[model samples]
Target chain A: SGGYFDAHALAMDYRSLGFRECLAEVARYLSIIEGLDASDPLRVRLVSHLNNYASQR
Target chain B: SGGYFDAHALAMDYRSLGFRECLAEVARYLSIIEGLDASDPLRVRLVSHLNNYASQR
Candidate 1:
């Protein structure tokens, strides 16, 4: 568990973030995940999602 | 964009992963994302999705 938040308790407070910031964050994650096995389906899905998300920005 | 794949080309190689492995992967991502601003809408949504995904496993 992450200690700061709970999976059971759901609450949201929308914060402002720039497009570049969002893109950068997603890109960073993609770079890390790409280092993992190429044959993983979930990884492929996630990387695709992130890539798609980044392109829209 | 990551060199291994492209968002433009949607190819899925569904490699098998166990439930516990999926849970662990999602949990790892959740922990990392929680460190960012708590007030981000996208983050909250992503986290919620991850948590929900984990609970189902």
Candidate 2:
């Protein structure tokens, strides 16, 4: 999950930007990650697990 | 690393910023991560691994 994963990259590069600026962009991605419809049980489970992992501290 | 982690937070919050804006900020942090001195073995190892991870693209 470092250096920005492929799918997570959203087909854009941010290596040239400031640090904090990249995070807020990543947060927006999280919004999309969390915003995904829970229509599929598999998706819900995966997203749920990720949500927990992210909630840490 | 969702919603910003403790150590990664760098003691700053950017949840309110627009999406891409946040990414530039995060990139700056990576600059710090990559910029760490390779004096300590542990620091070098961890940072090296992270640099590789981030370079995965």
Number of the top-ranking candidate, with DockQ as the measure: 2
Which fraction of the native contacts appears in each prediction? 0.00, 0.09
| Candidate 2: stretches off by over 4 Å | A1-57, B1-37
Q: How do all models score by TM-score?
A: 0.24, 0.21
Docking class of 2: incorrect
lDDT of 1 by residue, A8-42 (tens): 22211111122223333334443463344545554
What DockQ was computed for model 2? 0.06
Q: What is the C-alpha lDDT of each candidate?
A: 0.39, 0.36
List the TM values for chain B, per candidate.
0.38, 0.34
